[PDB]
């Protein structure tokens, strides 16, 4: 149905996302159990990790387009990522390595992430009809890899330990690299312009130097979240000032603020919603016992099933509004399950969490899939920088929000934790409903401005 390099990119993306979500699914628990962090420390440190992972995506598109070439930067990113995963596995021997290892994952992700999609775009003549379907299958590829990793990585870490789990993340990157190298012949005439000139060793060294520097800066920021906070605060106020100085951009600003709210909520899946499943949900569904950390896999699960359907099925601001209402309902459902449908021992049915994640995933499919695509319709490089900065800030904010659900390590009674989760999730849901209503009200004016 698709060009041959499509299947190469599909499977490279699958395996890279498998490695990443293998880490993400277990990381907060790793912080708590293996490093002895309180849940509060673990949640804010995960927020910092996620902020850096997301904010650095801005680098890899520039490196691939203008310095080294798309295909070269895919290779370099994959290698840095694999090194980061094996370094994380080594951190169990050398605990002091952990932050450096996570910084290496962040920087590796920054170099890699934008480039497979860029490559995929060049596999099709410019107005080919199959592009939309190919990109929906690409999103599904991301979420199949994520589904496998979030399902299996907690099981693997429980049965064989974290070193094995992280080394298997690394192995997934190695096999993404092997499948690329084996299929290299399929993309010989596909690439950005630097891909077809000899590699500049000057630029390569600049990229390696900057990467190493960034790995250390990331390690430091994740170790000292209280200054990552102020860094992103002052960067945010400053870039806001310079955005206001320099009206299709104003709609881009309001859509950016809505995206920030979405990412604050999305950040709850590996933290507060993860420990909510651990502490206050039954760990058995359809008669099978499961690791509750695996409940995170319900997000890619629902995306995989729902992306074709919603591909089969207003315009920009209304789709954003719809997604925000879906996200609101995910958190109101969590609150309601805890407030009214819990057992006498304080435990709720996992079907409520299945529904929570359905709502959240539909919100994702309306917002984040279709965000910078028609931010690119309203717009430049400066707004991309601001986009990645503000969404990184959203992940830091999300770690902070998650800390309101943190449970001290001595608490053992689910009836003590349940009202904490229900209060926080209910307030998240009410605030997000309010935001969705103001979004609805602005849809007509926004839609005029897009004209």
């Amino acid at each position, epitope marked *: 149905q698709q060009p041959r390099p499509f299947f190469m990119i599909f499977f490279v993306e699958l395996w890279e996302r498998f490695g990443y979500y293998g880490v993400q699914g277990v990381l907060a628990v790793f912080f708590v159990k293996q490093l002895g962090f309180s849940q509060e420390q673990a949640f804010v440190t995960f927020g910092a990790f996620a902020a850096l992972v997301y904010g650095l995506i801005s680098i890899g598109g520039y490196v691939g387009d203008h310095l080294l070439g798309t295909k070269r930067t895919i290779v370099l990113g994959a290698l840095v990522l694999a090194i980061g995963y094996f370094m994380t596995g080594m951190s169990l021997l050398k605990p002091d390595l952990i932050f450096i290892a996570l910084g290496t994952i962040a920087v590796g992700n920054g170099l890699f992430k934008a480039n497979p999609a860029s490559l995929l775009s060049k596999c099709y003549p410019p107005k080919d009809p199959r592009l939309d379907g190919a990109f929906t299958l690409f999103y599904m590829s991301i979420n199949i890899g994520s589904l496998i990793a979030l399902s299996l990585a907690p099981v693997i870490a429980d049965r064989f330990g974290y070193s094995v789990t992280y080394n298997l993340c690394g192995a997934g990157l190695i096999i993404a690299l092997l499948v690329y190298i084996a299929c290299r012949g399929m993309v010989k005439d596909i690439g950005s312009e630097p891909d077809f000139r000899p590699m500049s060793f000057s630029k390569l060294l600049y990229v390696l130097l900057g990467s190493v520097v960034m790995i250390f800066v990331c390690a430091w920021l994740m170790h000292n979240v209280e200054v990552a906070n102020l860094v992103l605060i002052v960067l945010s106020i400053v870039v806001t000032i310079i955005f206001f100085r320099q009206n299709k951009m104003f709609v881009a600003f309001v859509l950016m603020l809505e995206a920030v709210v979405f990412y604050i909520l999305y950040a709850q899946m590996p933290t507060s919603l993860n420990f909510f499943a651990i502490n206050n949900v039954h760990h058995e569904i359809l008669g099978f016992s499961i690791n509750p950390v695996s409940f995170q896999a319900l997000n890619p699960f629902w995306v995989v099933l729902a992306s074709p359907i919603l591909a089969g099925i207003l315009s920009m601001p209304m789709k954003f509004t719809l997604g925000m209402f879906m996200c609101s309902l995910g958190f109101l459902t969590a609150a309601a399950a805890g407030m009214w449908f819990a057992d006498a*021992q304080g435990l709720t049915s996992p079907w409520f969490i299945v529904l929570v994640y359905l709502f959240q995933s539909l919100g994702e499919l309306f917002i984040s899939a279709l965000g910078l695509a028609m931010i690119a319709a309203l717009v430049m490089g400066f707004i991309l920088g601001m986009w990645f900065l503000t969404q990184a800030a959203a992940f830091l904010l999300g770690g902070y929000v998650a800390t309101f659900t943190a449970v001290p390590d001595n608490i053992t009674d689910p009836l003590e934790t349940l009202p904490v989760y229900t209060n926080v999730f209910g307030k998240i849901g009410l605030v997000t409903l309010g935001v969705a209503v103001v979004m609805l009200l602005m849809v007509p004016w926004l839609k005029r401005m897009i004209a």
Partner: nanobody
Amino acid sequence: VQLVESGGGLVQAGGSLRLSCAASGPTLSNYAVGWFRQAPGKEREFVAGINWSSGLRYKDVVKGRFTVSRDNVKDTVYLQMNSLKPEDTAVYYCAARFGGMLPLQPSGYANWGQGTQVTVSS
């Protein structure tokens, strides 16, 4: 995923016994381990437990007499039962639930030992 209990038996009132729970494939380290007991003609009841991060929970009638503790090197959880009384006679079970919570009812736990008879004679 499967727990092996050891250490039951027969003891006179005022004596002591120690139960131990060990797991096989999964590391017990990630699990809250609760001890339940079922006396003749009654339901399983929570007795005592330890969560994955050293938090403790006890039934009222065993406080000051039973101590739950954990050896994370040997991957074992222990129930030390002192000042035993005839009405502590029961089949004792260990149960394991992933995480930090010790729910009071058997349905909160997925993994179960087979049960060890504890008898306390007057």
